[PDB]
């Protein structure tokens, strides 16, 4: 129907054209008949009939008289909904300035007439005159005259000049401007100017003038002469229960405007003193600005209930505004909500749905089927049968829900796994039964959590639920590629208990034909779960090439291990089961099954694993008791020793040998050591036991303590919690941050006393409040990332670029932080991977590095590779498939139409709550910094070189001595400037000292061309450069934190990409969160979207103008095709907020935040929105140009092409 949305100024003729009448009175409704008045705010002649196909006087009261305007009353006989569309207008007695175009800094009016805002308000508030027409007089346009001066110069000259006061004067000045002449004047002066500040001033003014002349708008339209009036049903006056009436504040604001307008019209007939008329004009202006935007001008007007009246800008903007409350999110039908219980009998694709909920949600479907198969003649028959709850209704409900998927959601929806599709199973009850293996994706625990259920209606939605959102498809985490359905808690505990090994268990040394006879022996009480036996195992291996090799052997195992092997699918080695199975082991089992067998086998295996784990955890009988918390006897003696030594050091302090700070520090150290030793003793006592073996001696065995089994299996608990239960609680922190000297020498078994509990509360409160605030901080970060990266969709297959990024293993000392296999798994090769020391092509270009090629690279010892990345792609909009590579959630190449930006934003934002020289290897030494490389050719140590045992190329043996998380990420993504940044060498050249000017110092550099560049350095700066040294570009002059803007300007795109990726991944890896770097690179690509033109060239670009980089690239390609001088640009790093607010679409920018500024700028510039991204199509209800809708939009892009 429509392809674009245009925005611009509203002329008085246009506002009159929108209107169906003029509102003349502040009347709303009658106090007896409750009918609208003529010429009021609810007039039926202006806005439409109150009743469908009726008129106020009631003469024409049927559809026979449709479209006939009644002569007695004037009401058109039509539908009532026209009262939601028809507008009105008010003809203002005096012109009024628009508040948005005046007080939204920078002032468009003030910028246009080149006068300060205070001057314009002084004219508007009726304090000073302004000359409109100077005439044949020394006076100039726009110069102020006070009342006295106006009188003297009126006596001096008379009618030669014209001076006015108020909004009328501003209107005449705006209408008298000759925009092209002013534009030429600014162009010439800019051609002959030197100051940079005046350059910026005239650049903005010229941009505004050019925008006005191009958009077709007229400046005088910023002063309103006719005011539009909103349709009544959007500001309703409705009867409430009990006879009370409810109204919108817009009614009060409009009534004030109309009253003051009528009073002004009356005062201009009963000719009145100029002071009174001036005051009334002031009233009219204040009322109009209050109606448009309350609180911007000054004191916000309040109602009879003493809170500010809500204006139109408040309707439009904010968290409660129409964009975010009703357009980007909605309440939906066919939805329900209930508490969630656990269904251990369910399959991965099934969810338990209560019968009453299904009856309510699927009611139209039930009606349809009852009408179709004939038990209901009409729709009220079906409704009555459903209400009476007959049996056949239940069979019909079963048949409708037979294979109709439903969508389950849990708030907060941190990532796309928070909504998934399941096949419903009707259950008796009122609670939704949820499969345990999906809880980790939902972050759902059964302590009162509630879930929402949605019913997809159309066939397309059903097939999207079955194919995309179904639980069996989403088993890999899109953030990292790891399985997200890994078992936890009782499943892990059962698989651990069944796979443990006991000495001298019943049935030891027995020979079993296979897993079946192990099961038979366990069920017949011949052998225990933990008996060491020999079992015949038939094992089939599926190789990388697909070879299936089957072979049988006798293996020394445990009965439980064979019984578990019974459910392991064919194609997997038996070594994966022949061990005690913790959480890591089960995760490895599932990951290997997915890597070597596929998806269906993986889901069946996961279901069987969870069933078996539950069964054998129930059979184990694991329980917690007070005797399971064994307190080591060494704790009391260690506490006594620490206390005695603390007495000794107190004595030393009393002698003056040591100071107070030293005493504090070493007391902290001794208590920390005591805590560590008590924890070690408790672990050693808890983790072992002595048993009698078959031959009769004593043997050491791993303990079967319930708490130890709980901690070691990885089900619940870690060493810290057992330390708190059976060891020592340790040092705790005072609320300011300081650490109290005396620790809590008690655990939770003997219990704390009053003061120990008080110190515990000190930190407990801090933790809870920190979580409460950090949740909101992370949510706001995730929002910001989503709006910056929302437009990134895979739009192509190959972009045909040769650029790429260089990837090497991460080294932050003497050990590798992460191998290159992890960094390269799933990325496409950009430059051919030659074997080191050879010219053979091991890996061709445009190849996806899967597991097998990763193993090849690991075997051939490759250090540095080149791969395509999102930042280096050349696609005009979005990215291509090769530059992104594998999509982690699916395991194959990324498909066309995937919203990679939203995935990246969700992946980064989800873990936000969890957020807060001696050589050690043998090899050679290389100097660049210091690098120690193994004999295989891999760089394994990277060390700094401050301004050495071995020189360059000298071999070094082992041991030789050559000689705050979330705020950081948020600050990094907005590209903040550090408080004290590093001073960096602007240009490559020879350093030289300069005149130490008072206040702060200056330095100079001589370039290769002999030009001298001056630098402004503060006094307190430990300069590193020395005179006579040729420092390269990118060198550090003053040490300190590095600003990403400087890195981009002086080093390049790759440098800033690497910097951002490394720091954010340092923060994430500190807390043990694994996120792939392609998401971060998508965000960084969205940071690099604007360029400032330095050389204007011949293209329609002004110097120093920040424009979009893709537009410049397209223009430069066109100009190169035309053989004309292309533009020279510098690229800018923009923060996620500033990049989001500077999008080409003003709909997305207005829906993000700062709605007033975006709307004002777009209206002045006459912007046009093409609805190219996701948010715009979400607002207008269209299909998003991503995923299933992608093709659709492409078709339109063909139709507009033809």
């Amino acid at each position: 129907e429509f392809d674009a949305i245009k925005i611009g100024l509203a002329s008085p003729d246009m506002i009159r054209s929108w209107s169906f009448g003029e509102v003349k009175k502040p009347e709303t409704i009658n106090y007896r008949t409750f009918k609208p008045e003529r010429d009021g705010l609810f007039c039926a002649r202006i806005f439409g009939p109150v009743k469908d196909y009726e008129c106020l006087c009631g003469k024409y009261k049927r559809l026979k008289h449709r479209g006939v305007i009644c002569e007695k009353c004037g009401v058109e006989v039509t539908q009532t909904k026209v009262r939601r569309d028809r507008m009105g207008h008010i003809e203002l007695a005096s012109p009024v300035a628009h508040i948005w175009f005046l007080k939204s800094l920078p002032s468009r009016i003030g910028l246009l007439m080149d006068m300060p805002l205070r001057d314009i308000e002084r004219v508007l508030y009726f304090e000073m005159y302004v000359v409109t027409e100077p005439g044949m007089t020394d006076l100039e346009r726009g110069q102020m005259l006070t009342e006295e001066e106006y009188l003297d110069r009126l006596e001096e000259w008379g009618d030669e000049f014209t001076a006015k006061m108020g909004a009328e004067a501003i209107k005449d000045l705006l209408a008298s401007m000759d925009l092209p002449a002013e534009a030429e004047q600014m162009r010439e002066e800019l051609d002959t100017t030197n100051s940079e500040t005046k350059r910026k001033k005239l650049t903005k003014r010229l941009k505004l003038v050019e925008a006005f002349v191009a958009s077709g708008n007229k400046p005088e339209w910023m002063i309103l002469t006719v005011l539009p009036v909103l349709p009544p049903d959007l500001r309703p006056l409705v009867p409430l229960d009990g006879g009370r009436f409810a109204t919108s504040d817009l009614n009060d604001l409009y009534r004030r405007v109309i009253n003051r307008n009528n009073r002004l019209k009356r005062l201009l007939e009963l000719a009145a003193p100029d002071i009174i008329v001036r005051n009334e004009k002031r009233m009219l202006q204040e009322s109009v600005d209050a109606l448009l935007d309350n609180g911007r001008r000054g004191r916000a007007i309040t109602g009879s209930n003493k809170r500010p009246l809500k204006s139109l800008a408040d309707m439009i903007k904010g968290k409660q505004g129409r964009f975010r409350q009703n357009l980007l999110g909605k309440r939906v039908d066919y939805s329900g909500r209930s508490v969630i219980t656990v269904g251990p009998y369910l399959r991965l694709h099934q969810c338990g749905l209560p019968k009453k909920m299904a009856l309510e949600l699927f009611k139209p479907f039930i009606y349809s089927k009852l009408e179709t198969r004939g038990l209901a003649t009409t729709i009220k028959a079906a409704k009555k049968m459903v209400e009476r709850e007959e049996a056949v209704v239940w069979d019909i409900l079963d048949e409708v829900i037979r294979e109709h998927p439903v969508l389950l959601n849990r708030a907060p929806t941190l990532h796309r796994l928070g909504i998934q599709a399941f096949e419903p199973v009707l259950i008796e009850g009122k609670a939704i039964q949820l499969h345990p293996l999906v809880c980790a994706a939902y972050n759902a625990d059964f302590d009162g959590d509630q879930m929402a259920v949605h019913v997809p209606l159309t066939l397309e939605a059903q097939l999207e639920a079955r194919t995309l959102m179904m639980s069996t498809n989403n088993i890999l985490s899109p953030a990292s590629g790891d399985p997200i359905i890994v078992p936890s808690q009782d499943v892990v505990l059962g698989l651990y208990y069944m796979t443990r090994e006991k000495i001298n268990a019943k049935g030891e040394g027995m020979y079993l034909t296979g897993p079946a006879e192990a099961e038979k022996a366990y069920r017949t009480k011949t052998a225990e779960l933990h008996a060491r036996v020999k079992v015949r195992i038939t094992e089939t291996i599926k190789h990388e090439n697909g070879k299936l090799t089957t072979e049988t052997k006798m293996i020394d195992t445990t009965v439980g291990r064979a019984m578990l092997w019974q459910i392991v699918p064919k194609g997997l080695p038996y070594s994966l089961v022949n061990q005690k199975l913790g959480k890591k082991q089960i995760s490895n089992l599932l990951n290997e099954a997915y890597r070597k067998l596929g998806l269906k086998d993986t889901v069946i295996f996961a279901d069987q694993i969870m069933y078996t784990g539950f069964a054998y955890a129930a059979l184990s009988g694991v329980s917690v008791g007070i005797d399971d918390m064994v307190v080591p006897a060494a704790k009391y003696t260690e506490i006594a020793e620490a206390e005695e030594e603390v007495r000794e050091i107190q004595e030393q302090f009393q002698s003056g040998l040591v100071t107070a700070g030293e005493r504090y520090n070493k007391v902290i150290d001794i208590w920390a050591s005591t805590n560590d030793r008590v924890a070690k003793a408790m672990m050693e006592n808890l983790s072992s036991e002595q048993v009698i073996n078959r031959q009769g001696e004593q043997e050491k065995q791993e303990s079967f303590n319930s708490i130890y089994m709980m901690a070691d299996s990885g089900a619940r608990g870690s060493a810290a919690q057992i330390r708190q239960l059976a060891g020592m609680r340790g040092l705790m922190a005072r609320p300011d941050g300081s650490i109290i000297e005396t620790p809590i020498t008690a655990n939770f078994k003997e219990g704390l006393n009053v003061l120990q509990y008080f110190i515990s509360t000190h930190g407990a409160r801090k933790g809870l409040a920190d979580t409460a605030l950090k949740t909101a901080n992370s949510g706001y970060l995730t929002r910001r990332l989503v709006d910056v990266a929302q437009d990134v969709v895979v739009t192509e297959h190959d972009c045909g670029t040769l650029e790429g990024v260089v990837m090497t293993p991460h080294i932050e000392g003497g050990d590798v932080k992460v191998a290159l296999t992890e960094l390269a798994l799933g990325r496409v090769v950009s430059e051919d991977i030659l074997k080191p020391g050879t010219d053979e092509v091991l890996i061709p270009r445009n190849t996806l590095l899967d597991e097998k090629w990763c193993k090849v690279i690991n075997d051939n010892s490759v250090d540095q590779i080149k791969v395509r990345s999102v930042v280096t792609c050349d696609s005009d909009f979005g990215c291509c498939a090769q530059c992104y590579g594998r999509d982690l959630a699916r395991g194959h190449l990324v498909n066309q139409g995937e919203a990679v930006g939203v995935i990246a934003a969700q992946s980064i934002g989800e873990p936000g709550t969890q957020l807060t020289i001696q050589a050690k290897n043998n090899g050679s030494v290389k100097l660049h910094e210091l690098t120690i490389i193994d004999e295989f050719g891999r760089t394994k140590e990277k060390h700094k070189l401050p301004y050495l045992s071995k020189a360059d190329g000298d071999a070094v043996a082992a041991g030789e001595t050559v000689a705050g998380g979330l705020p950081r990420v948020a600050d990094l993504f907005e590209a903040r400037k550090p408080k004290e940044p590093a001073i960096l060498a602007e240009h490559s050249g020879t350093v030289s000292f300069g005149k130490e000017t008072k206040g702060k110092r200056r330095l100079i550099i001589t370039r290769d061309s002999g030009d001298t560049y001056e630098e402004m350095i503060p006094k307190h700066r430990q300069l590193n450069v020395f005179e006579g040294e040729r420092i390269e570009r990118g060198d550090v002059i003053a040490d300190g934190p590095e600003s990403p803007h400087d890195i981009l300007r002086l080093r390049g795109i790759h440098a800033v990409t690497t910097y951002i990726a490394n720091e954010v991944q340092e923060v994430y890896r500190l807390q043990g969160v694994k996120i792939n770097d392609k998401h971060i690179e998508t965000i960084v690509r969205q940071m690099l979207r604007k360029c400032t033109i330095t050389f204007a060239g011949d293209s329609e670009f002004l110097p120093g103008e920040t424009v979009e980089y893709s537009q410049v690239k397209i223009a430069n390609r066109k100009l190169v095709e035309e053989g004309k001088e292309p533009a020279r640009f510098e690229r800018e790093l923009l923060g996620i907020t500033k990049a989001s607010l500077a999008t080409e679409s003003f709909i997305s920018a207005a829906s993000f935040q700062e709605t007033t500024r975006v709307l004002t700028e777009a209206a002045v510039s006459g912007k046009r929105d093409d609805l190219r991204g996701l948010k715009e199509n979400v607002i207008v209800g269209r299909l998003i140009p991503a995923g299933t809708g992608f093709a659709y939009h492409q078709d339109r892009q063909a139709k507009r092409a033809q």
């Binding site: 129907e1 429509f2 392809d3 674009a4 949305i5 245009k6 925005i7 611009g8 100024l9 509203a10 002329s11 246009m14 506002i15 929108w18 939601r84 569309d85 507008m87 628009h98 948005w100 309103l224 005011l227 539009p228 009036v229 909103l230 349709p231 959007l234 448009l292 139109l312 800008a313 309707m315 439009i316 129409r322 964009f323 009703n326 357009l327 909605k330 309440r331 939906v332 039908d333 066919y334 939805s335 139209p364 479907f365 009606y367 349809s368 089927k369 009408e371 179709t372 729709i379 209606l457 159309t458 066939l459 059903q462 709307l1159 209206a1163 046009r1168 607002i1179 207008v1180 209800g1181 269209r1182």
Partner: protein, 48 residues
Amino acid sequence: KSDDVNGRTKMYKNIVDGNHAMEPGMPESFNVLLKEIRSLGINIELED
């Protein structure tokens, strides 16, 4: 499901008829948005 007035009645009728197809239109909230932006004296409109 939320604010397409004609579309939701059409969807209900189609489901009763066993068709499972929708004819999406313009949400009412967007029309309200346009009306308020126009009430703020700004010409916002749809181009064909």
